[model samples]
Target: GSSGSSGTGERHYECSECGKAFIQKSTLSMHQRIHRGEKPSGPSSG
Candidate 1:
């Protein structure tokens, strides 16, 4: 039998707006744009 090892990657960057977790700080910052009415991709208005 194989030994159980808890080696799953942990998310250090957490978003306050929606309680979402990200692997990197930049990723979390990008995700917060949604709560700030900003778009991560194309223009938000068009």
Candidate 2:
């Protein structure tokens, strides 16, 4: 399920729930929180 695209230049991972593409897998994983009705939480950065 992970290997959906190849030769990545831009966004590759596509969210089936909302049809959004992210450059990194971590970002896509974070974006998935919305679909799961989860709150965003993480360390603060300047």
Candidate 3:
């Protein structure tokens, strides 16, 4: 992460419910999509 980057380091959080980690707020919100019968895409796919 660059020191001059606005999207850097501003997107990390710890979840209290599962002690999980989130890289971005929007990512956290989007993560709920996984539970909504949505399939994951790309490199992480099996």
Candidate 4:
């Protein structure tokens, strides 16, 4: 997450379903949920 410890970002997150991945952990985390049919998630949402 946070693009590795340095946060520079070399290899990001990868989905456990489609096998696709992202360069950002946070972003990947969100994307993975979407695969399960999720949407904008955060404290802002009520």
lDDT of 2 by residue, 1-46 (tens): 5776665666478788889988788889998888996555767575
Model 1 residue 15 CA deviation (Å) reads 0.4
Candidate 4 lDDT over 1-46, as tens digits, reads 3554665547668889789867788888887776786556566755
Ten residues in a row with the worst lDDT in model 1? 37-46
lDDT by residue for model 1 (1-46), tens: 7886676766398899899988899988988988997548766595
- Which has the greatest TM-score? 1
After superposition on all C-alphas, the RMSD of every candidate to the true structure, in Å, is 8.1, 12.1, 10.1, 10.3
Q: Rank the candidates by lDDT, best first.
A: 1, 2, 4, 3
lDDT of each: 0.83, 0.78, 0.63, 0.75
Query: 1 or 2, which is superior by TM-score?
Result: 1
Which segments of candidate 3 are over 4 A away from where they belong?
1-11, 32-46
Tens-digit lDDT track of model 3 for 1-46: 6566567545576555446678776766666555556556768955
Candidate 1 Cα errors over 4 Å, as ranges? 1-11, 38-46
lDDT of 3 at 12: 76
**Shift in Å, residue 13, candidate 2:** 0.7
